[PDB]
């Protein structure tokens, strides 16, 4: 588990994940040192695969970022080798189209009354905007909330009514992609 | 699994070798011809509008076009007919900086490659690369040009709807015929590999002489293609550029002309 991670340079302006390691586990990132990392629309934490999404690089993102991996089956959280990242002089990265980096599956199998907590996030110069909606027009019944700026979309009680097709959208001024994926029911 | 490596840094070309055995062999592509030593083709198919199932795909290397119309090529001392495959680009960095593989040392913007394999004793591409047999590959250049080529519309267009590394689409109609030179008479010829890992020594290569006119503008939809590098534990964003290997030594090789 114990890894040297080497310093890692890069660019203002660029888009960036910090990879945590391993895949019934809850993720957290700190910064620096024990404890957390400010999620907002340019940063997201991903309990999927345990990633730290950072859309575009500020200056203020220089330092230390360390992830915490704690297992459900207790209150047991052990830290990675914190990777240090700095800023390249040499130039800034420009503005490009939004890149959807970590996203639900193209189809995912829900019991019923279960939560279903659907992932976008989307690295992008500039911060890119997540859009959710159904792919057959229909609007969201009202159980369905927007959690984590927009980046996760939670529909509790899961029933059958709520299958269909999802669509995220995430855009910028220099474009728009779309991650589409079928919610199917089972009891 | 396939060995990481990427057109710089600590898996660079001149890093390949290292895990590419091949990559450090003799007859490895491309390289420079010489026009002061140097020294009929019949082309099925080019003539047609592509299909619209036709699609393009950005590698992260390169920007791939997966043909799905029947083109063959024979002669120029081919072994045999052979039928295209896919294509795919090689560019600079902007304003028209040099990006092409081969040269003479005249390089131009963009490179472009067709690649195919004989399916009179094969099935697809895909098994012609397993079982290291030789395959054909066209290299046609792109020179700027004061004035839009609208041969290039799909393609372009195509580039476009691919920024992202796996990204994918469909391409309008196009003619792949006028993807090369106004005149195919001048080429040359010479025995070489892929210029990408592994590097397999099993390739034929055609380069047109003459190249194909792109502007500024239509050449700028290149530049804007980015790909990602998988470094540590760091995944990042870059911009895809100057996708070219070294040009090689010809050691024991001689070029045709024709």
Same mark, same amino acid.
């Given at each position: *588990?114990? %890894?040297?991670? +080497?310093?890692?340079?890069?660019?203002?302006?660029?888009?960036?994940?910090?990879?945590?390691?391993?895949?019934?586990?809850?993720?957290?990132?700190?910064?620096?040192?024990?404890?957390?990392?400010?999620?907002?629309?340019?940063?997201?934490? +991903?309990?999927?695969?345990?990633?730290?999404?950072?859309?575009?690089?500020?200056?203020?993102?220089?330092?230390?970022?360390?992830?915490?991996?704690?297992?459900?089956?207790?209150?047991?959280?052990?830290?990675? +080798?914190?990777?240090?990242?700095?800023?390249?002089?040499?130039?800034? !990265?420009?503005?490009?189209?939004?890149?959807?980096?970590?996203?639900?599956?193209?189809?995912?199998?829900?019991?019923?009354? +279960?939560?279903?907590?659907?992932?976008?996030?989307?690295?992008?110069?500039?911060?890119?905007?997540?859009?959710? %909606? %159904?792919?057959?027009? !229909?609007?969201?019944?009202?159980?369905?909330?927007?959690?984590?700026?927009?980046? !996760?979309?939670?529909?509790?009680?899961?029933?059958?009514?709520?299958?269909?097709?999802?669509?995220?959208?995430?855009?910028?001024?220099?474009? *728009?992609?779309?991650?589409?994926?079928?919610?199917?029911?089972?009891? | 699994?396939?060995? &990481?490596?990427?057109?710089?840094?600590?898996?660079? #070309?001149?890093?390949?070798?290292?895990?590419?055995?091949?990559?450090? $062999?003799?007859?490895?592509?491309?390289?420079?011809?010489?026009?002061?030593?140097?020294?009929?083709?019949?082309?099925?198919?080019?003539?047609?509008?592509?299909?619209?199932?036709?699609?393009?795909?950005?590698?992260?290397?390169?920007?791939?076009?997966?043909?799905?119309?029947? &083109?063959?090529?024979? $002669?120029?001392?081919?072994?045999?007919?052979?039928?295209?495959?896919?294509?795919?680009?090689?560019?600079?960095?902007?304003? $028209?900086?040099?990006?092409?593989?081969?040269?003479? $040392?005249?390089?131009?913007?963009?490179?472009?490659?067709?690649?195919?394999?004989?399916?009179?004793?094969?099935?697809?591409?895909?098994?012609?690369?397993?079982?290291?047999?030789?395959?054909?590959?066209?290299?046609?250049?792109?020179?700027?040009?004061?004035?839009?080529?609208?041969?290039?519309? #799909?393609?372009?267009?195509?580039?476009?709807?691919?920024?992202?590394?796996?990204?994918?689409?469909?391409?309008?109609?196009?003619?792949?015929?006028?993807?090369?030179?106004?005149?195919?008479?001048?080429?040359?010829?010479?025995?070489?590999?892929?210029?990408? #890992?592994?590097?397999?020594?099993?390739?034929?290569?055609?380069?047109?002489?003459?190249?194909?006119?792109?502007?500024?503008?239509?050449?700028?939809?290149?530049?804007?293609?980015?790909?990602?590098?998988?470094?540590?534990?760091?995944?990042?964003?870059?911009?895809?550029?100057?996708?070219?290997? #070294?040009?090689?030594?010809?050691?024991?090789?001689?070029?045709?002309?024709?």
């Amino acid at each position: *588990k114990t %890894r040297m991670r +080497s310093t890692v340079s890069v660019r203002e302006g660029q888009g960036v994940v910090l990879l945590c390691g391993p895949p019934e586990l809850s993720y957290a990132w700190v910064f620096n040192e024990y404890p957390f990392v400010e999620e907002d629309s340019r940063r997201f934490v +991903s309990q999927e695969t345990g990633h730290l999404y950072i859309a575009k690089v500020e200056p203020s993102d220089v330092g230390n970022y360390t992830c915490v991996v704690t297992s459900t089956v207790t209150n047991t959280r052990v830290l990675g +080798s914190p990777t240090p990242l700095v800023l390249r002089s040499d130039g800034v !990265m420009g503005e490009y189209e939004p890149k959807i980096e970590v996203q639900f599956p193209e189809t995912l199998p829900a019991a019923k009354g +279960s939560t279903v907590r659907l992932e976008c996030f989307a690295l992008g110069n500039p911060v890119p905007q997540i859009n959710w %909606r %159904r792919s057959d027009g !229909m609007p969201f019944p009202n159980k369905i909330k927007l959690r984590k700026f927009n980046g !996760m979309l939670e529909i509790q009680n899961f029933q059958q009514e709520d299958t269909g097709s999802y669509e995220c959208i995430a855009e910028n001024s220099r474009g *728009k992609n779309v991650a589409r994926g079928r919610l199917t029911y089972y009891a | 699994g396939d060995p &990481y490596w990427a057109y710089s840094g600590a898996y660079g #070309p001149e890093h390949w070798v290292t895990s590419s055995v091949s990559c450090g $062999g003799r007859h490895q592509s491309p390289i420079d011809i010489l026009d002061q030593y140097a020294r009929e083709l019949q082309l099925d198919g080019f003539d047609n509008e592509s299909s619209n199932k036709t699609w393009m795909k950005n590698t992260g290397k390169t920007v791939a076009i997966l043909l799905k119309d029947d &083109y063959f090529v024979s $002669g120029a001392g081919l072994p045999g007919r052979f039928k295209a495959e896919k294509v795919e680009f090689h560019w600079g960095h902007s304003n $028209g900086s040099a990006g092409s593989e081969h040269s003479n $040392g005249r390089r131009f913007p963009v490179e472009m490659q067709i690649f195919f394999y004989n399916p009179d004793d094969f099935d697809s591409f895909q098994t012609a690369i397993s079982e290291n047999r030789i395959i054909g590959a066209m290299a046609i250049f792109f020179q700027v040009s004061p004035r839009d080529n609208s041969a290039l519309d #799909p393609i372009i267009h195509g580039l476009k709807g691919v920024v992202h590394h796996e990204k994918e689409t469909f391409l309008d109609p196009f003619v792949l015929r006028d993807l090369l030179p106004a005149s195919l008479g001048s080429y040359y010829r010479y025995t070489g590999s892929l210029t990408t #890992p592994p590097c397999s020594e099993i390739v034929e290569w055609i380069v047109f002489r003459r190249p194909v006119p792109i502007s500024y503008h239509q050449l700028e939809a290149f530049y804007s293609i980015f790909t990602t590098e998988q470094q540590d534990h760091v995944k990042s964003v870059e911009y895809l550029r100057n996708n070219f290997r #070294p040009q090689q030594r010809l050691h024991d090789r001689v070029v045709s002309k024709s």
